[PDB]
Amino acid sequence: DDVRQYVVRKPLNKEGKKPRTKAPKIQRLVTPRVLQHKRRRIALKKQRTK
RNA sequence: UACCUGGUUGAUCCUGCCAGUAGCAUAUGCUUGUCUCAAAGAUUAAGCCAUGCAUGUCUAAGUACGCACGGCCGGUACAGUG
Ligand SMILES: [Mg+2]
Ligand SMILES: [Mg+2]
Ligand SMILES: [Mg+2]
Ligand SMILES: [Mg+2]
Ligand SMILES: [Mg+2]
Ligand SMILES: [Mg+2]
Ligand SMILES: [Mg+2]
């Protein structure tokens, strides 16, 4: 499942301001940047060995 | 600038100190127009202290769900300022 679809967003409703909703930033979320960082670490290991 | 002068005797020559002489540091007195530097609660009490200040700090890059602002789109997990 996709955890991005179940984030509980709090409805922000202030007088005089356009009503809307807010969501937190998911932590410990596997993202392409995390995988790329892991790949780079492994690549550095390979370079050191070579 | 490698310097002396007054004072013991009726007078002399000595010894010898007292006093004078110049600088330098602290204080103090009288006086003081310009201008450049500039010391400054050490000495007595490392005695006692009202009050205020004297040490804080965020980048692109640890943690943002404060609408505190501001969205752009509005379910686009997380825009940005913070
Ligand atoms: Mg005699
Ligand atoms: Mg005489
Ligand atoms: Mg003398
Ligand atoms: Mg004199
Ligand atoms: Mg003047
Ligand atoms: Mg002092
Ligand atoms: Mg003192």
Swiss-Prot record:
Cellular location(s): Cytoplasm; Nucleus, Nucleolus
PTM comment text: Ribosomal protein S6 is the major substrate of protein kinases in eukaryote ribosomes. The phosphorylation is stimulated by growth factors, tumor promoting agents, and mitogens. It is dephosphorylated at growth arrest.
Source superkingdom: Eukaryota
Subunit structure, as described in the record: Component of the small ribosomal subunit. Part of the small subunit (SSU) processome, composed of more than 70 proteins and the RNA chaperone small nucleolar RNA (snoRNA) U3.
General function of this protein: Component of the 40S small ribosomal subunit. Plays an important role in controlling cell growth and proliferation through the selective translation of particular classes of mRNA. Part of the small subunit (SSU) processome, first precursor of the small eukaryotic ribosomal subunit.
Family per similarity comment: Belongs to the eukaryotic ribosomal protein eS6 family.
Protein name per the record: Small ribosomal subunit protein eS6
Gene source species: Homo sapiens
Taxonomic lineage from the root: Eukaryota, Metazoa, Chordata, Craniata, Vertebrata
Gene: RPS6
